[PDB]
Amino acid sequence: APLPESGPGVVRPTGTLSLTCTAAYGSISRHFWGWVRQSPQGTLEWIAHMHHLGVKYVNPSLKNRVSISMDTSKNQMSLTLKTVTATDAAKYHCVRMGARMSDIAFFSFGDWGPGSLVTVSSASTKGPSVFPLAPSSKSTSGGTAALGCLVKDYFPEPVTVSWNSGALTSGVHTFPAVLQSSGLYSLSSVVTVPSSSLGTQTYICNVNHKPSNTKVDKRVEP
């Protein structure tokens, strides 16, 4: 199955998009693996797929600028898309595929990666400023409280946000980002926790903004 796909976040117009897919839990040399992009409107478009021995199929409307390759020693597949245009903005998914050859030839997109979001823009990446949203029991059920992190003014999407290094998942809600007239995103991540844990348990939001290579571990204290 594919790990989260690796990408640049943002690509300038006429620039080159470079994506890398890494297989986990097995080898990349046992299947066809492909790329399918999901548009902002939510439609699906096949890009290419290949097998590590060299058989490649590329979408003809993209053939003049697509390259696809595998590195079996790294268990990885790469996609290169040159001369990018605005309509190349999409979520790019790496997929482990099924294949059959009888009297009929057949493929299937069996295991889809979460996808790498690609924004086409000339603006430069900006990393987030992170501020604590100190806990409050005004709005929560009995014995609980809400606390969180404000992740301000970053570009492009996304930011990933975990709590206590992934040890805390229950009651976590990371809200979709607002897109501001400045062209920058802000979001909030909140966790609902027992009030009695405010003293005993420390709460750190782990903010990662891969496009800018910025990480923040923010301690959220009452």
């Binding site: 999901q38 939510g42 998914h93 997109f109 802000s186």
Partner: protein, 209 residues
């Protein structure tokens, strides 16, 4: 080339939904069906016209006759609300074709009131010479909400940024509204309020320096 596909549709729970795929260049090509839910990657639910993938209930079934293929969903439950896509491989021209997608919505979902949490500016943000009030609105259905801000009791006319409602994994919605102030504006009023209206009822939360 995009396969034709049924217009988006609304089905009452317990009834049957039929989502069709067609096109000249579909022919007898075996059809795969994909489900796309919010927060999740697409998943293969039916392959090679009519094979259920693992995890696909007996309620889901696929058929194919002529240059039409159909995904039939019996005994529909609200969990089946999703976008559905068909897909084939053309071995003559060596191309993958997808359908354009069909949105299935399930009727009769009861109204759900938003949970609203308002946070004041943090002390740290004020030290950086900025002030953001954060009004978080979640688990509401249907996905339409009105957000208004007050400075004391006066309507705020500037500084508000509010998201469009976003469907979450339980098919309820979430939204966020941010009010940007100077520290001086934040400190010179007695209070600020986020007012959230949903289906004609209103919740107002208020914070003060």
């Amino acid at each position: 080339y995009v396969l034709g596909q049924s217009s988006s549709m609304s089905v009452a729970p317990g009834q049957t939904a039929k989502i069709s795929c067609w096109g000249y260049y579909m022919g007898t090509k075996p059809v795969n069906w994909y489900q796309l839910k919010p927060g999740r990657a697409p998943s293969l639910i039916i392959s090679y016209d009519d094979e259920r993938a693992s995890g696909t209930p007996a309620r889901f079934s696929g058929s194919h006759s002529g240059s039409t293929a159909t995904l039939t969903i019996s005994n529909v439950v609200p969990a089946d609300e999703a976008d559905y896509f068909c897909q084939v491989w053309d071995s003559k021209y060596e191309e993958i074709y997808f359908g354009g997608g069909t949105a299935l919505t399930v009727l009769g979902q009861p109204k759900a009131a938003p949970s609203v949490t308002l946070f004041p500016p943090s002390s740290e943000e004020l030290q950086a010479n900025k002030a953001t009030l954060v009004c978080l609105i979640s688990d509401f259905y249907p996905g339409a909400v009105t957000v208004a801000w007050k400075a004391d009791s006066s309507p705020v006319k500037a500084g508000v940024e509010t998201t469009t409602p976003s469907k979450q994994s339980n098919n309820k919605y979430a939204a966020s509204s941010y009010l940007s102030l100077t520290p001086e504006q934040w400190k010179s009023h007695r209070s600020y309020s986020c007012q959230v209206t949903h289906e004609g009822s209103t919740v107002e939360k208020t914070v003060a320096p």
